[PDB]
Amino acid sequence: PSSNGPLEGTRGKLKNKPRDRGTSPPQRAVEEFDDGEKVHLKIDPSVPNGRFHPRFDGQTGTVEGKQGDAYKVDIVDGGKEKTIIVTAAHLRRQE
Amino acid sequence: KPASMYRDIDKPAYTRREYITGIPGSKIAQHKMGRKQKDADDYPVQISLIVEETVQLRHGSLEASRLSANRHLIKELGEEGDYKMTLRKFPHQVLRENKDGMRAAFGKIVGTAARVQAGEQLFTAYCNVEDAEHVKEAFRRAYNKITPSCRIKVERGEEL
Amino acid sequence: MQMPRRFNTYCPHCNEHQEHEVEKVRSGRQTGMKWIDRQRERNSGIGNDGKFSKVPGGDKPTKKTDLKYRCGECGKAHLREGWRAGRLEFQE
């Protein structure tokens, strides 16, 4: 990389396909997840607030509590355990 | 410079002019030759010059082969004969040269080339039955000035 | 950038919002009686004086904001983290 910033090489993952442009539907932004629930981490390009570091896009973590409205999701980066603060807008349920 | 320096397709596709400056103009005069007002379907015979290997042909070679091909067609059929030849490939790939040793090695722009795949039509001439052996000779002179071996394939010729 | 002389904000002393006045911190004069001043006179002898033989360095292209936020009622001031500004002018 020519720069070590957060949005380096994220043209693809943090961009919507033309038909998925504009404001995202609210139903998923207010979704309620319970502890122990396995959730899919994927940033919604239309939602600015409540994101995570793009390096974790594609992870399937485990919800272990919440901090305000955002969720504290437990993932494993390679071999290191990490706790990701993320809103419902960027999470989908497993199965 | 020899074609050995630029004939292979081992380099990336370098065509984006919005990032490349100082590109020399094409030595190619025209792609449409003969009677450019008449249609391609108005001719009973269609003969194409097909490239057998996947190569990069420079603008100078494209011109040198086109010139010695059309010049034969002008000599044998006249300046207004009943034929029409087309050079369907355009020189899009931009060429560099490192002309200081290997430090700051990315070269300066020196020319343009045409990436032609194997089995592709470089030239396509449309003629009448009587002028068929003249166009087969225009291509025999044209294939001598490019890099690969070629085929002279007749696409609409049941007249033999 | 331009900045208002007076505006409403939190007073960490009064525990409530009040109309504060802003002033650029005027440097206080040195006494020459601190420990460092005594070490200068002490540790300095023949030849090089080590740290005391050094001269003050250069400058950063733009300095940070060095303000004083004076409270309007209780009259006590507080300090805030400054920001880079080439020139800071006051409004009224």
Binding site: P18, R19, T23, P26, V30 | - | -
Partner: protein, 186 residues
């Protein structure tokens, strides 16, 4: 419409029925929405919670089912608005609903308007909705004093059908009383 890159808005936005930006803020409370709608002749008031395949309505009241309790006056006004709101809040109490947030939809938050009167009704029914007392109408305009005093500028009657001449805002008082009663078939 034009090609593949064209972005067609969400259905209820093409229809111009839902303010999706305001909806997100309304759903952030977690509390059920007190949907306050108004038509030309009528007024609707629903209690809506969030569901898996769409919204769920647990309790509602339309100004047409107000006549089932004794109303003999028009249904698209201020006294009707409060009552339809009181009737919605009362059915809500029976459904186990205790608190709510006011959804006025695409209506304007104009002081003393019908949607705020629908809210005043539900508050008086026992529901805990975040409000502002001075944005609501003064008790007499809710009662229907403005309408009775417009019939005072008579010459010709305000009402076509025979309800009464000088108009009775006392029917409001009588109806609030009928609904405030512990018995009543809801």
């Amino acid at each position: 419409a034009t090609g593949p890159r064209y972005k067609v808005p969400m259905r209820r936005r093409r229809e111009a029925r839902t303010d999706y930006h305001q909806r997100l803020r309304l759903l952030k409370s977690g509390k059920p929405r007190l949907v306050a709608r108004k038509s030309n002749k009528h007024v609707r008031a629903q209690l809506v919670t969030l569901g898996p395949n769409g919204d769920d309505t647990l309790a509602s009241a339309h100004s047409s089912d107000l006549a089932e309790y004794g109303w003999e006056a028009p249904t698209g006004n201020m006294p009707s608005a409060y009552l339809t709101g009181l009737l919605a809040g009362l059915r809500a109490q029976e459904a186990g609903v205790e608190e709510a947030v006011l959804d006025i939809g695409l209506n304007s938050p104009t002081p003393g308007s019908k949607v705020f009167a629908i809210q005043e009704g539900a508050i008086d029914a026992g529901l805990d909705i975040p409000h502002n007392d001075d944005v609501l109408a003064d008790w007499q305009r809710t009662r229907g004093a403005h309408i009775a005093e417009y019939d005072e500028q008579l010459e010709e009657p305000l009402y076509s059908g025979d309800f009464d001449a000088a108009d009775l805002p006392e029917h409001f008082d009588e109806l609030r009383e009928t609904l405030l009663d512990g018995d009543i078939e809801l």
